[PDB]
């Protein structure tokens, strides 16, 4: 809980100010991307894509006026620059994936994710209603894609690399 | 601190820097010779605290002290409801001698008055996104409870009050958490939280409403 989330150089992950890659510890070849799900015409679901590494960088944000992130904080997670709320993560029921990670254009004050230590890195945990019980984000294989989606007990484990290559 | 300026050196002698491997992550406020008040969200299992500072380099600040603390108590209702009751008390491993650059401040017993201009100080981000080299000071005005609940319900709780949100864009920002909001001579609030980004017209920041906690604070300090 009171543990500070750190990047792959061991430094505290910043609150909103920097972008970071979520690098899978057992799938370092793959990176986050947006893909189509169900019948949508725009790509709105987040996949682990073997074609892109390190993938789309994200920012972790808390309303707290602190510039570090702890594992106990509720976080919004978003693609894109801080000035934009068009790539905000949410978890949305979608058949046949399940509870799929998707991107939206609206942000609540408190997001529903936490970043929690797991194995050698961190998993993303979704808290429906921001209550006490969290659901692990892992991978759901459907239609030739590996979708980030709830898979409780089967988390995809990531390490967090500051996105200074850009 | 958004749109403020260098404080006059040592003009806020209750200001405490909480630092972690030599980097500031929060402030605190000396409220007794052996106790610093900070936001509960800044909790760590132990602290290095900087008192008497202006720049954050102690080796350049005569009169400053870098002190250790292991004990801290979060308020028992911290984060129920979420974000509420955001205060904790850090016990310094030893009491400090007060001087003119290290001094504690009295806590307001009356609750904030809508409209009143107050001062916030801290070393968090400036309008341009960088960290300042010396402590920043800014005035912000208390917003009414009606406006605060309107903008922040369902997360507005009376353990908070709003200040700022003016056309002047003066506000707190990341790194200011835990530091003081001073009204009319007394410690009225602690920097707590707001909606990003900082210094938006019409969006005030939210501060811990210390006038609600004076009894717990006193009892905790005396036990
Ligand atoms: Cl790496
Ligand atoms: Cl459908």
Residue boundaries of the structural domains of chain B: 1-12+105-213, 13-104+214-223
Name the phi and psi angles at B222, rounded to 5.
-85, -15
Cβ(B190)–Cβ(B38) below 8 Å: yes
Q: Please, what's the b/e burial string for A149-165 (b: 16 or more CB within 10 A of its CB; e: otherwise)?
A: bbbeeebbbbbbbbbee
- What is the rounded CA–CA span in Å between residue A67 and residue A65? 7
Q: How far is A14 from chain B (nearest CA, A)?
A: 9
Phi, psi torsion values for B15, nearest 5 degrees: -70, 135
**Declared resolution, Å:** 2.1
Strands (E), B33-178: 35-38, 47-51, 65-74, 88-92, 117-122, 136-141, 160-163
Q: How many CB atoms lie under 10 A from the CB of residue A93?
A: 9
Q: Which helix or strand (DSSP H or E) is residue A59 part of?
A: strand A58-61
Q: How far apart are CA B2 and CA B170, in angstroms?
A: 5
* Degrees, nearest 5: CA angle B96-B137-B166: 140
Nearest ligand (C-alpha, residue A21): 1
Taking the domains of chain A in order of start, what are their residue ranges? 1-166
**From the CA of A166, how far away is ligand 1's center (Å)?**
15
Q: Could you tell me if B26 and B88 are in contact, meaning their C-beta atoms sit under 8 angstroms apart?
A: no
A110 min Cα distance to partner chain B (Å): 9
Q: Which residue of B has its CA nearest to A131?
A: B82
A88-94 and A98-104 beta bridge pairing: antiparallel
Q: What is the DSSP string of B1-50?
A: -BS-EEPPTTS-TTEEEEEETTEEEEEEEEEETTEEEE-GGG--SSEEEE
- Which structure tokens are listed for B145? 């409870």
Active site residues of B: 41, 86, 177
Cα end-to-end span (Å), chain A: 31
Instruction: At A136, list the tokens.
Output: 């692990």
Q: Are strands B117-122 and B47-51 parallel, antiparallel or unpaired?
A: unpaired
Place of tokens 């894609």: A145
Q: How many CA atoms lie within 13 A of A41 on its CB side?
A: 0
A16's tokens: 């909103």
């Amino acid at each position: 809980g009171s543990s500070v989330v750190v990047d792959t150089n061991g430094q505290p992950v910043s609150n909103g100010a920097d972008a970071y890659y979520l690098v899978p510890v057992s799938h370092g070849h793959a990176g986050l991307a947006l893909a189509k799900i169900g019948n949508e015409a725009e790509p709105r679901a987040v996949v682990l894509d073997p074609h892109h590494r390190p993938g789309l960088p994200v920012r972790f944000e808390s309303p707290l006026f602190i510039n570090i992130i702890k594992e106990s904080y509720f976080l919004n997670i978003k693609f894109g620059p801080s000035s934009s709320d068009s790539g905000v993560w949410d978890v949305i029921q979608q058949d046949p994936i399940g509870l799929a990670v998707k991107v939206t254009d609206t942000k609540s004050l408190l997001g529903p994710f936490k970043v929690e230590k797991e194995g050698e890195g961190y998993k993303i945990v979704y808290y429906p209603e921001r209550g006490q019980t969290g659901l692990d984000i892992g991978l759901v294989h459907r239609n030739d894609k590996y979708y980030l989606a709830v898979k409780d007990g089967e988390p995809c484990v990531f390490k967090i690399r500051k996105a200074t290559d850009e | 601190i958004i749109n403020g300026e260098d404080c006059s050196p040592h003009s806020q002698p209750w200001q405490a820097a909480l630092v972690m491997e030599n980097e500031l992550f929060c402030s605190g406020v000396l409220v007794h010779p052996q106790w610093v008040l900070s936001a509960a969200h800044c909790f760590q299992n132990s602290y290095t605290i900087g008192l008497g500072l202006h720049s954050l380099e102690a080796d350049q600040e005569p009169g400053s002290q870098m002190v250790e603390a292991s004990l801290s108590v979060r308020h028992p209702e911290y984060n129920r409801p979420l974000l509420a009751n955001d205060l904790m008390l850090i016990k310094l491993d030893e009491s400090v001698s007060e001087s003119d650059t290290i001094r504690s401040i009295s806590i307001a017993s009356q609750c904030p008055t809508a409209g009143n201009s107050c001062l916030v100080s801290g070393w968090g981000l400036l309008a341009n996104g960088r960290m300042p080299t010396v402590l920043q000071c800014v005035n912000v005005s208390v917003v009414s409870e009606e406006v605060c609940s309107k903008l922040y319900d369902p997360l507005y709780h009376p353990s908070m009050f709003c200040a700022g949100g003016g056309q002047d864009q003066k506000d707190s920002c990341n790194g200011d958490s835990g530091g003081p909001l001073i009204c009319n001579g007394y410690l009225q609030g602690l920097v707590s939280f707001g909606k990003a980004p900082c210094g938006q017209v019409g969006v005030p920041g939210v501060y811990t409403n210390l006038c609600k906690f004076t009894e717990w604070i006193e009892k905790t300090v005396q036990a």
